[PDB]
């Protein structure tokens, strides 16, 4: 009935965060949390494929993409399962994460349990950029902090 | 077909390690890797319920126990699903992990994906200690290092 998850974001830099997930029945995944130590503005936020922290955030691999689609924003029909768009930090360096998404899940084929949340150096262009990179990573740049998505009480 | 997972163990002391998991279909889970910085002797080694790292190893909660049993050793009928017994550290503080288990899984109800691996200060008494604590934790004591079990390549 009710699934819950948690992710502790850590990096080599000063970006830290806690993300909570909750999914009631087949209702959407409600995502809520904070990230701190960010530069002011938009930062890409995606579920990456692998919950593998052997190489910091590098070993998380690419956006979770079981449908083998191109990169989008959450509202796009053409998106990675893992494409959760951008979070906005204010001048205090804090983003409030508040996302509702029905493509991700906490169970079944699309479950993100044991995958990695990543927050990025730069704005995700939502796949609307001109170059090839936009269709891949939305040009969100480097990985500031990541964590493995765990089952929570 | 084949499912792989990985766990990086960390704590506030000298203990760390990387644990690898593989499962072919509905078969046994094969557990390998190494842990360093341990005292010579046997150390409890379990899957705990929650992949929650908000309070170090404490927020991992109790042994994974979906069948509501008492603690035991991996060979016991009466055991928690997370009960993987003891790893053994040599004079040099290194444990070579080599376990095959039939209760844990990398998918379905027994999945340890998104849960926590914990290595303990003391030997697990395999539920044979004759106090109530033996029937919960095997008297394995404190949690030296832990990490969330992630989907791996
Ligand atoms: Cu990303
Ligand atoms: Cu334990
Ligand atoms: Zn993407
Ligand atoms: Zn137990």
Curated annotation (Swiss-Prot), chains A, B:
Destroys radicals which are normally produced within the cells and which are toxic to biological systems. The keyword Membrane does not apply. Disulfide bonds join 57-146. The keyword Cytoplasm applies. Its EC number is 1.15.1.1. Cu cation binds at residues 46, 48, 63, 120. This is Superoxide dismutase [Cu-Zn]. PANTHER family: SUPEROXIDE DISMUTASE CU-ZN -RELATED. Belongs to the Cu-Zn superoxide dismutase family. The modification N6-succinyllysine is found at residues 4, 10, 91, 122. GO terms for molecular function: copper ion binding; superoxide dismutase activity. It comes from Canis lupus familiaris (Dog). One of its GO terms (biological process) is removal of superoxide radicals.
